[PDB]
Symmetry: C5
Subunit: 120 residues, 5 copies
Amino acid sequence: VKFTTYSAAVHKVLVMVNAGILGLLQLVSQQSSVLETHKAAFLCFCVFILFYAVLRVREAMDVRLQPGLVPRLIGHGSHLFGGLAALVLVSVVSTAFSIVLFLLWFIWLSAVVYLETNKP
Amino acid sequence: VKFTTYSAAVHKVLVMVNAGILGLLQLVSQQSSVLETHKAAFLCFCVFILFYAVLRVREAMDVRLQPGLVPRLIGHGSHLFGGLAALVLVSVVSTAFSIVLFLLWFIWLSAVVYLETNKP
Amino acid sequence: VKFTTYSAAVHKVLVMVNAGILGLLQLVSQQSSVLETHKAAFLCFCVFILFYAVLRVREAMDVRLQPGLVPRLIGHGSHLFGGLAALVLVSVVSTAFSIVLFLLWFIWLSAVVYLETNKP
Amino acid sequence: VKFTTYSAAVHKVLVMVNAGILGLLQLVSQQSSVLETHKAAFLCFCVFILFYAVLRVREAMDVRLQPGLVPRLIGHGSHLFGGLAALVLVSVVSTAFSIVLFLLWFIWLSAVVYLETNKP
Amino acid sequence: VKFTTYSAAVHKVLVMVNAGILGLLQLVSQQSSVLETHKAAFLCFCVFILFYAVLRVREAMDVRLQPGLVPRLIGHGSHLFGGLAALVLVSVVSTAFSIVLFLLWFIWLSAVVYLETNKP
């Protein structure tokens, strides 16, 4: 039953940080525009977070029905996409945390699958 | 009883993405204004989301009374209008996701009616 | 008992739209200032929404005590003031929705009193 | 038991108006800066709202323990500081509502103590 | 059982003030940029608040299991990091509250450990 709690709280903070990063890059350049530059990142961002929302919805749908693996996968991928979005977006400030967080997501999925398959 | 849960969660994320898109186009042009240009989109946006709110209200009113089709239609159209608004607004950044999301809404309503009439 | 639900949900969306309109007119003129121009509207806006808050508070205070008319009036006027504020503020973008929403509020109060006095 | 309800709801709207006023003065001068000018107000604002937070916390801590006067004072002063902050900040737009709201806070504390001492 | 309440409420206000400070420095210089200048502070800020989120999550995970010291430490450090972040960020407006709040955090941790070890 731990699962739903984990999922809810993580949903919460993930929304937090995403909004915060958008808040930051409200503060980029009074000099030039960056909506056009780096266009690609935003263009991917929208669809990404959309994947996020549509995952979370079915996750919250499937709570009472099953605590099993079927919903497990769903919720987990939902949590994935959003961190991915935050990564891509934050990239625009600099490329350092970009790669650092690429790597963190990598190890994160690694530990996920590790625990997934460490036991039947 | 699935219905109310579906509706609530979808309400939530829909608000999320709408606010986020507004956040983005807070970041359009330090060069020129776009409130005047593309006026039409905002002018439709306001009334659209207003339809949204007035639908959600009666939906939440009708929860305890009926799980049937009568509220079903209401809630569903409420969810419709808001996605429509997000579409129109996001258009201003570019016309690509514009048509993509036009199409997605199209197929979405299609599947809706499909399941509506697939069984008595 | 319908009453409190109606009131809560309406409170919610009303806050939503107010914040959204403020979000929009964060996007008015990189050309000139409009805080000074149209000053009057904001100057009335603050006190208006203040009426709003102080009404909602006593409304939520009076929930458990009475489902009757006494709280009915209070909650209803609370809902009034905020829509009024949204009207005044949005005016600054244009005078069209201004009058349209003036009229909508008018008919809204009309239907209110209609149902109030249609029966003992 | 009225007390906690009063406190919660008032907390809510107070946060509302504070955020709204900050929203407004996001819209001051594309001409010049006012973070430097009027510095003093913000410099006091931060510590003020900090008093606010640290009061509300112990208030919510002391809910289950006592409905008495001890928590009464705490919660009440917590509500005080925030209105004070809103006053100081809004001042920067103009000095009129400044004094008006000074006076309103004055009468407000007056009625508070009035009812505090009107009966044992 | 006091613990979870304390933690929740403190979480709440801490988020409040962080968002507010970001709101402020949305209002820094229409003259020059400060995202580049003072880069270091933001660069540390992101990872800091990330520590914050990942702590709060396991804290909320461990609620039902234990009211003991093990979760005590976790929650407490979670509350630490965020205040630290607010400190670093606010620094950019001025160096005064910077050191003042450095000192406040210092004394705060001091009282923490004081009460931690004042009794078995």
